[model samples]
Target chain A: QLKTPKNVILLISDGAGLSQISSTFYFKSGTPNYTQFKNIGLIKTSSSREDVTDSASGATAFSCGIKTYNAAIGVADDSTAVKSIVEIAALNNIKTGVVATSSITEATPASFYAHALNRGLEEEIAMDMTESDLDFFAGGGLNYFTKRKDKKDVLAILKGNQFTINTTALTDFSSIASNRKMGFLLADEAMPTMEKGRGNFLSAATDLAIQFLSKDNSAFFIMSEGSQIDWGGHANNASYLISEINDFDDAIGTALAFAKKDGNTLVIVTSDHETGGFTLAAKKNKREDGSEYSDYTEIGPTFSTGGHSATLIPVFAYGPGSEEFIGIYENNEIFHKILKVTKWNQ
Target chain B: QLKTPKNVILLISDGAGLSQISSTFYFKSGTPNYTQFKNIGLIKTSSSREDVTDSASGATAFSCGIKTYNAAIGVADDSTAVKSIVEIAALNNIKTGVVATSSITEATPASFYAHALNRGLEEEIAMDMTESDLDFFAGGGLNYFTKRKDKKDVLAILKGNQFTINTTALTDFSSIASNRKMGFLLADEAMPTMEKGRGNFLSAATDLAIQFLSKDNSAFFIMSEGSQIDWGGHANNASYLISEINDFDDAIGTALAFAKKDGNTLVIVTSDHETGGFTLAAKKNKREDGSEYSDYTEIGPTFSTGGHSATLIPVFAYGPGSEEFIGIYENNEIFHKILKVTKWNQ
Candidate 1:
């Protein structure tokens, strides 16, 4: 049960909690891949200075192993830059990657590679990525790099740093044969919602990252996010939230499928915090008259807030060393648990 | 890890889901005993005929291992009597007990011993209890026995079965040493709520049952319920729900305290389903005039419905064979899992 893993894939369904995740069971087309997990844990997500966590501090807790302020990214509460799992993985010669439906410079994905005083500094976060340890990455944020506020061509800087940048489409592994690093920017801002035809982007990027990282069968670390689950919550749109989490569940299926086949990749699925105070209530019904009541046969998804809520989110793990995740803990322990299991810091 | 257990204790928080359980982490005075558990699972709680289940079919699923319809108590959808775990335990000579904050003839506690067609049959349920295999029982429902419509004299009938019944306070374990059966009906209907001076009855009754059942080192099965959590949800009262679940947490602490020492007992904590659409949302704030916003500094508990929901409920397990309970599964699977872990059905 204490076996070491050669790779770790952490999937964050941003802004998702138990209720949001439960939608996959009721609304999805078939049996969810989440059902495959046995070693489940719950995490309390609170910032160093706040009771309810924002995505910035939430991801920083997982990435840097510190209780940071609400808007911090890859830094401590006092704005001190902290190292991330990707940085440590790089030190041990393990490949690192990040994929998100949001901008690559967004909080959840940016925390794995960038340091900033606040998550609002997207252009700065995009610049920080040029020096990060990420060997492979994908998602949006084309405007932050190509159209910078200071007119500094981060795009040219990335080219000089030997990155195989793709703006058109995700190509096969063979297409980037000569490069040691790869990047993709498919949208100007965040990716399109699943309803708007953002199909297979999250899972496809994950599969590609795994293939690129394991090209030589070396150790690797990748963080793939179903980033828009939070956006749907903030919008208080159940249809949007359900579709986003369903896609996130699909991304998890990709990671778990790889772990099951590779046998050495430890897959961890979790969320930063719950959003919208979303709940699956009973559908409302109308009598022949003007009266109404709740109908239990169908669902009535409801929301209680427009922002994050303080609640425990479930963590699921599989493959080698997954047993270490089978207990309740804070979000930061995710970093320590991964390092301890893979011995990447050794 | 598939080791058999000598005893099984199931604690059901009726209408409690993850959010209700999450309240224990925040609203409780100390560390919740739920944190002591490592093996956690989630159960889908829809009945066979309805997407949202009532307490009757919910308890029937646990006691009989079937997907009976809503309101069906200890019977199939066709109303055919089904054997309960208490009945099966009797065939194997295992000691059994039932406790609840609600009436002992209520849907939850009654489902374990009585073969009633529906949850509304309290009088019939109490009469059926005279022929049950329960060695120890506690909670209210004196009216169902003594003030019955059929004038069956269930009180005298229970006495004829060698039961030393008490209607006052819970006495010491040694008081009923001469008798093989013990029962306590502290109220005519349901026990008082925790907020109404119902102090440590749940935990105390649990401890007393543990002591009574294991007096001769005999195998035992007991189901204790925090029955009022559902009542609070139905009333849409936050204070009521919080206090009820807090009392349930104490009950769990008692069971875990014993199982940790015994090492041969499997303790499970779960709920029949979620109610109230209860959520730990951000505190609502208002602008100087008319605008409103969410304040993330503290939780503002909120509810969306006064009925059951289809959300997945968490199951916490500890001690022998607890690992077998880890995963996403249907509610009825819990019954089969307990039997398989203990080999009681063999």
Candidate 2:
């Protein structure tokens, strides 16, 4: 018989691949939280319409358990809305939350509650979130709620729906009541990068979400994203990518610590896709004769492309039912495997 | 109690990272045999003296359970010979074999039985192999055995050590006797590439190894390598890498088929290290104005470096006690884990 988890935390490290994960080993100070996972799997991140996947279709695969086209959010390949895991959990009386280093209305987080033909429709995504059954959310994109192209105030709409909105900071978990829904839009756009002092935001917000959602002995589902790693990849900035991944690994530590203590929570860490074709290449050493040889003692981070690559991403899982996550599979299988292990149905 | 395997087959796809593995899914027909495994893990490939590892140190880690310096063969960091899995298996009355797409005396296969301070000592590696307790072997390095600078005829020495040597071709498994030790040296050095019609050599040799080694119902240990994938990566040849990995995946199928049917065999698939920083990036398309945009419809294979990268490699295991292989660990832990599972000791 398989063990069932009472809560599930899906952490998405956007554009993080094995090389990115490997950075935690070389760049970090201690043993990485990723090493704590025993059940590991490789996920193929191709969308229905392309050989490569973008964040929208990639997250949709996790949220809806379907192979969708690129740039699609919470919809099938035909642009039809599908019931997301958050929706299903909400129907089952399980509290749901979304957290990201990117704007809450971005592709990775938006897919959890919003349906759109194109991920670029941030206003529509924010509007969809007002009607969502989410119990908690922590991210940026306050402007998408207040200053919209459609001139509709989504913040007021969320307030009308009984959400306790905090625009300035993440609220203290101890101060919040179990009966109230919480939302934090801390930045006008995306959150600051780790290098810019985004210090512990991902982990702290996730911990707050966990504490808030689990208050009433209720099962909960949360999806948190390390969104800026992809941006660093696009810029070919090694320092940015390394720092972001280190922060993401710390967030993994947070989730893992909770799961280890709770003993009834499942923590899964994965990625939407690989960005930059990132590689931890050997450092180049020029000889006196002007020829170059690789210096094996140091790493010289390199990229093959300025965009996403179609490499298989690694998936790390811990706690109850994590063994189900092992083996090679399509990215969409993650949703089905979660459902299979949890025995959850709409 | 964990079920112990009667035999173990370790298949190494040299330089086969997740990208190389991903190629089997996109480039090969039908489901890749890699999907058949449920027990998976990641291996950190750093050498003792370097941040990045070469095949010599990488294979030595698996063979000797030590983090040796790069280019070290079966010796430890102190330049002392260590007991290898082959030696331990032989001491435990288990049959042993080594097969490779490269010469048998190459860095990977040589690490299993021959102890040398440097991988460049191919002639010395070949001389050491003559005294090894290996029961069945197949691959090239014929010139290393007969045309040494020291004018040593290692083939005659191997024959004196009771080896039934075959240099023409891989003989039919039915023709080999259970009582005789077998060896096949089919090329002057390394074997032909898969694109050059190396046709079934890896799988054929491995199948023959299994048939010959397991004839007496004794526990056996064999290591087979698809060594040319690294060469492809070094050359930055996508076609060479893809074809080699596809062929490697086929040999995995062969091992899995045998293990599944026998129900007492453990099959492990992994790589020494990542090479070329190979990535399957999106194809570039130019608009009418000549601005390049990523075309997601097709894959564009790209490389980031001419040398190996310090990326973690994936490990896939199946059959009895396969569960032990799941998790992130040092590459040398592979030797300990296999020994722990098989209870084989020197």
Candidate 3:
């Protein structure tokens, strides 16, 4: 019988659509980890006031289970803060972790542990993180914590809240294994794109976060984001988009491998919405007379817009309780499905 | 327990990818029948020799369970004629039907019944249709059957093969309710596009085909298609594409209603490949300074390439044996999954 998972890993590949998922198969050497899932779903990702969504509202929909206005982070459409899945997990004594290639104070990662009226208030978000219940966190945004307009020592505040912070690189779990709270700020801003040698940061961070959160055999909730897939889409850079998604695909592999071994862990991978109107179109070739025609033998990798689109995003789930995700629903339903499957909010 | 379905309806929306499917959520008035399915899957549609695929090879993969070269219909990569799902169903006493808005001899429909080395050989494909085991057929292509370059009286040949042919209209099923084989040719070529007032043909023909095939409580395999969606994509006409998919969405509604009522029928909705690189990008708005920016409130439908793309196609399935359709796989695996679920090959 399918049972509820004790641990949950939610992997968000920001701005990726079906075509973005398909690129990993074509552009990467091995089979993408995306093919490992048996349960699949599609989500309609429109903000409360807009047909096409920005990252702030989209992530808030996933985090808070409410349709919020565009640019609202960790808050509802009425500008009030709401409880995130991480907060609910905290009530259930479930260990919580957040990791992303973007800054820890970015819209997506920040939505899990920080409450801010607007996504641009990263300094406020960083301060909110000092009081959050996240057991482990890994990402950038050291500048948001240390270099601020109001000039407060947020690092000292984090230390006072019992967080063991590492601002250089992702160190070994043994170095901070006994600490109840662990944090890694690897960059001053968002991590570099995969093409610029981001390496295995996403997958490594996910592996480390899972290790840190589950160290004491406690139930855990982890949110690991391949955050820059959206940036490449906004820039309309095909190579950047492909490489970033490829890294995200590897991150999915890490989670899936762990979930397969630890049958109590459920891995759910999805996106906020599609960006770049990205398409894997046919390449253009010239005829003998120099007329151009689409060549069906090669891929072109094209885009229709530099901004986000209103396309439905695909959700791939694996491990215990994965069956709950196999259907179409609005974006906010992701939060409800998580609680329903794990009974964590009960 | 999930059981094998007594009947199966495969609804193919030609040239539809995830974006085209998303259109049903936006442009359509009512809820799309696609939302009724819980089991969703995705397929890779690459041809044997190309990164991208054509309808012939794509449909052949579904019909024959083999990776064929591009432009191939009902054949393997070697161009040899292969057995189709209809042929397999006929062996198992399963009533078979084919319906489409395009000519029945077109690539998608022809792959289910006729065997052709090249999809362009419509005349030859039509002649092969006379020998197909289809109990019911509905679509256009009167020219391929009667106005042939070879001057052969194919109409007489069809009648000689025990088919009750109707050239003008989709008459009442009562008129030919007792006929073992029924055929409807509603146009000289392909049916009119939805924008040009092709009213209820796709859905009505689907309803009629189901009625004709399962008239005697017989198990059936029906492949009904919204064929002109691809044509609209080829023309890069957003309105035409949207209208065509809307018609297809209604056809899906017809099939789903019947399946829900029957309880023993499996309904599958999918597409061969994506066309036009179509996207639902945000609408552009002008500032007072004469600059343009994306407006997230409204949609701006746009196209990138006019030909097919290499994106993975989504597959939505419902009813008994539908769960077998979950997970990502090569397009040809669809044929194997069908046989595995229904035990038709045995």
Candidate 4:
């Protein structure tokens, strides 16, 4: 039998389908960190209400083990709020954290800590995060906390709850007090894309979060996302998508580096859904006469739709209890499988 | 440690990428057999000579554990013949078989037994089959054996080698003696498409192969292909692809059912490459005023390329030694992995 994991790190790459992931093999300089994984699976990403799922329902499935509607957050199919993995982990005295390239109030990150009827309620989602038991959090959405229409500062609420809120940059993990929670709101809204000089924000933030959460030698559950890959797909911008995925792959390397050393940590890398109907088509070459032929040496990226597609997303895993994540299943099974492997209870 | 498998069944769904596999969830009735597997992996399918691989090189990788040129069959990148899994299995007293929905002389099935300079050498490939020690074989290409341009009777040669040949249809396994080999060439070239009433041919042939190869209580290796899913993708015909994948899923059920009962068989289901850049996009609906909206309840299948796309293909495995197949690797690693798990030597 497989050993249960003491800690679990679930890393999500929004809109990184097989095609999107395949781009790293070509565009990236060396072998992608994806090759380091030994256990893999596929998840069917359809929503409870539709044949295709959006990020809200998709993230909710991973957070709360339920097949909810397209816009539901931390809710079941019937719109009832369910306890998330973060809540359960916190209740069990396990440290919990969330990090993303998107705003903290965005659907993918918010579903882990906030409950809402619609993902569009960003202000309400920001308020919910202040009340959440998340021990560490990082991403964007400073405006959502400080510049709300109600003129109420949710950042003050988070500070009142003993969070060491940092709005300027990701601070060194060495400076964090062992007893105090940590939060980083580094941008006004969503973080800058890789093409826009996002640099190693995702990997560096994840590395800091892991170090901070594990400072007390306590088991933890952290969810980090490479969120802008979806935006690139939505725009049908191949270069943008490629850059974002390359960065996401770096974040995967960070989680894997920790898991490989911890021995008791389980690292799972997956996507909530596929966006842009992406395809790595053969590169086209024109002769002197202007006739075109597909060049087999290079790739020419193409897209079918501006929105998400109903393709099965891949799941890569490593470390203790990683084998449980292998197989084809509904998206909600990810939550149950994590609980099974970690023996976590509500 | 995982137990070593006594038998291995490698099922190849040609051109069936994650998107093609996704079709089963949306188009087929009830749950797909793919869910029965709990060990999954992904393969990078670039050939030695190109960024994207064709069926010939793809199958050669699995058959011989070498990266070959695009059209090379059972040869390495330098066009040198390599010992295939079938030949190695036979030397170790393990029964071997090959089955496909395409012609037996096709690139996929041929790679298992034939050493040819190119996959286009059908008659030569057919002649190699007569010289092979394969215990059982099935699929199309009767003309390649009987109506050859060289006026050679390959069927007669196969008969001289203690084989029971069936040219018209798949015969009862009971008719063949335990000591004799079996061959079935059911069509002129490729078999009928699943939509053209090719009912249970793949599954039945696979079932027969298992029973025949295991009758002597010896270890076995069988390679079966669902060839038409790729054909459907190449044609950009959604219904055709769906129908073919539905049938392939049935064949997977057959393999899994036998492997589950036998308890010592390693059943692996995977694809050579993804064809057509297939996507399950949201259906578009137009209002009376000509405004358009995406229908979330329905899917519109779309394609970006008529040829294969450079996407990572998924791998699913079950039974003893199956866990070894869970991970990301080059396509040729499939051969090495199988040998590693089974402890089969060169």
By lDDT, the best candidate is 2
Please report how far candidate 1 places residue A80 from its true position, in Å.
1.2
Superposed model 2: Cα runs more than 4 Å off: B288-291
Clashing pairs in 4: A38-B327
In candidate 3, what are the lDDT values of residues B1-346, reduced to their tens digit? Answer: 5799999999999999999989889999988878888999999999999999999999999999999999999988888899889999999999999999999899999999988889999999999989989889999999999999999989889999999999989887788898979999889999988877889998998898888888877999999999999988999899999999999999988999999999999998999999998899999999988699889998989888889999999999998999999999999999998888888864
Where is model 3 more than 4 Å wrong at Cα? none
Model 1 interface CAPRI class: medium
Model 4: CA > 4 A from native: A288-290, B288-292
lDDT of 2 by residue, A70-158 (tens): 99999999999999999999988899999999999999999999999999999999999988999999999999999998888789999
CA lDDT of each prediction against the hidden true structure: 0.91, 0.92, 0.92, 0.91
> On residues A220-319, what C-alpha lDDT tens digit does candidate 4 reach at each position?
9999999999999999999999999999999999999988888999999999999888988888889987698787667799888888899999988899
Q: Per-residue alpha-carbon lDDT of model 4 for B117-230, expressed as tens digits?
A: 999999999999877889899999999999989999888999899888888887777776554889999999999888788899999999999999888688999999998899
Interface RMSD (Å) of candidate 2: 0.7
* Candidate 2 chain B, run of 10 with poorest lDDT: B171-180
TM-score of chain B of 3: 0.98
Question: Over the stretch A1-346, how does candidate 3's per-residue lDDT look in tens digits?
Answer: 5678999999999999999999998999899999999999999999999999999999999999999999998899999989999999999999999999999999999889988889999999999998889889999888998889999989899888999999988877788888869999989998887777889988888888888888878899999999999999999999999999999999999999999998899999999999998999989888989778988889999998999999999999997889999899999999999998899864
- lDDT string, candidate 1, B41-140, tens digits: 9998889888888899999999999999889889988889988889888888899999999999999998999987789988888988888989999998
Arranged by lDDT, best first:
2, 3, 4, 1
Per-model TM-score on C-alpha atoms: 0.98, 0.98, 0.98, 0.96
DockQ values for all predictions? 0.74, 0.89, 0.91, 0.75
Top candidate on DockQ is 3
